[PDB]
Protein: Smoothelin splice isoform L2
Organism: Homo sapiens
Amino acid sequence: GSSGSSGIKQMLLDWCRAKTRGYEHVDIQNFSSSWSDGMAFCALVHNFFPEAFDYGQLSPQNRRQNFEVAFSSAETHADCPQLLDTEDMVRLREPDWKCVYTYIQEFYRCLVQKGLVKTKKSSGPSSG
């Protein structure tokens, strides 16, 4: 049927939910429009560091606040690099998945070191 045995693009989507489980007015299904509202990003973060910023405090109407806050809240103690362009994200009817995906992969790098995500070591062949 389809090619590619494994796919990071999958574990990424399935993961986000695991951390965004329960969150109201939220549902991660794809990096197409699921992150066009703004709340999405925030939620995912709030989960890790809720005290860092208030979730229910933000609003869905705010296209920037949701984004910015979501970004800053991280840089706080996660000092994560801001790749996405909130400014461009706003005007853009939908957040280019090609980009959103990058962030998720990036942040997942800071968390691991932060001590939030406990990844495993799968001893296998050399892929590099």
Remarks:
- The longest helix spans residues 97-114.
- Helices lie at 8-19, 39-48, 63-78, 86-91, 97-114.
